[PDB]
Design a protein around this ligand. Structure first.
Ligand SMILES: C[S@@+](CC[C@H](N)C(=O)[O-])C[C@H]1O[C@@H](n2cnc3c(N)ncnc32)[C@H](O)[C@@H]1O
Ligand SMILES: C[S@@+](CC[C@H](N)C(=O)[O-])C[C@H]1O[C@@H](n2cnc3c(N)ncnc32)[C@H](O)[C@@H]1O
Lengths: 212, 212
């Protein structure tokens, strides 16, 4: 994803839009089904902080991290207007500065399109490291490899599996890293054992992982 | 720059890395602001061809040239996987084999650290020659002379302005030719008149030149 893509759509940047709320209310019940015990949570690639505020209201100590200065800037204003104590930090999910075993939870939502294989490998490694052995890694992603076929329902869809990426034209174009449930889980198997898994929609998944 | 430096960092060798994409998306809008009319483009010192594919998708006839056999080899594989018609050739920017007035555009991005004064002089001369009088020379460079002071934020930085070079240690060391906006433009004034100039970041510049 990129600058224009996010400026144009509210789904990941406008916490009060119907698009964003829809995402929250869909995941909310699933997140509570596996986050009964409160603790320290890390919102990796938090965007504008929507899921952070949600967890903070459920009695969680939240820390939000994102690589975009713009995402973080908006996050803070939202935290200000909502009088939130969630701390937002501009950081790289591929290399976090937190100490080892710092979190009880680490949530990673709708963000894999931003990582190629070797980068997602680094993120998983970092997640396992900053997670307490008793902690939980919870991620939600879309099998865009399976969705690719009938994705157009957007003017064009130019794939390239010889690279695992795809260009979608809406004008402007965006190139996404394409992931399939089998590819995500393979890399996950190097660092975690799966606690649970929920199928969302036609091709989305909420997975609960425990660090090794 | 050199072999290890490029093998270690993805910025100029991994077209799908976040580092490389960041560079593309930052320059993309600026390149279109001065490349409204499509035509024949020469990507001088193209590296792995990232900016070539970008222009090719915008409807440009692209030719990529680089002195490294390795850069060119990877470029071709990327072109294959992306099913691109961009032709990559292993050549020397200091002495191109193209006929005079062959291109409408010649882009030169993040590559001056590789040229000492007399070499960059030869490149500019060659660029003017292969460029159509109505063509445009577009280069992006970093004033590493101004950046030198606060570059460390890398273990060491050993300059040597009595030579216009600097050694940066990350292990391994790399020696870069150091250029300042004033030095680059001086040599440019011998062959071109400037059409436009955009300041990028704290000390980087995108310059548009017209041949004399
Ligand atoms: C779909 S968006 C927002 C996702 C957010 N978790 C949500 O559900 O609202 C994906 C975010 O990933 C972030 N991102 C991309 N690469 C990153 C990296 N290396 N480290 C941290 N965040 C990154 C972007 O800045 C972008 O805000
Ligand atoms: C930072 S790198 C890649 C730059 C590329 N334009 C990009 O932005 O992705 C600089 C490139 O300059 C090339 N180079 C160095 N000397 C050269 C010469 N005399 N002729 C052509 N390319 C040269 C290298 O092989 C190296 O790939």
């Amino acid at each position: 994803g990129f600058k224009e893509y996010y400026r144009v759509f509210p789904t990941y940047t406008d916490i009060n839009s119907q698009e964003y709320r829809s995402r929250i209310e869909t995941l909310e019940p699933l997140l509570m089904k596996y986050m009964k015990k409160r603790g320290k949570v890390l919102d990796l690639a938090c965007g504008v902080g929507g899921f952070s505020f949600l967890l903070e209201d459920y009695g969680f100590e939240v820390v939000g991290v994102d690589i975009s200065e713009d995402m973080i800037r908006k996050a803070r204003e939202y935290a200000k207007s909502r009088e939130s104590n969630v701390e937002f930090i501009v950081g790289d999910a591929r290399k976090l500065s937190f100490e080892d075993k710092t979190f009880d939870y680490v949530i990673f939502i709708d963000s894999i399109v931003h990582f190629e294989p070797l980068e997602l490998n680094q993120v998983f490694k970092e997640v396992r490291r900053v997670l307490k052995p008793s902690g939980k890694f919870i991620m939600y992603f879309t099998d865009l490899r399976e969705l690719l076929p009938r994705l157009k329902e957007i003017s064009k869809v130019i794939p390239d599996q010889e690279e695992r990426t795809v260009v979608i034209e809406f004008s402007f174009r965006v190139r996404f890293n394409v992931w399939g449930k089998t590819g995500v889980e393979l890399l996950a198997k190097l660092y975690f054992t799966k606690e649970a898994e929920e199928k969302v929609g036609n091709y989305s998944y909420l997975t609960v992982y425990n660090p090794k």
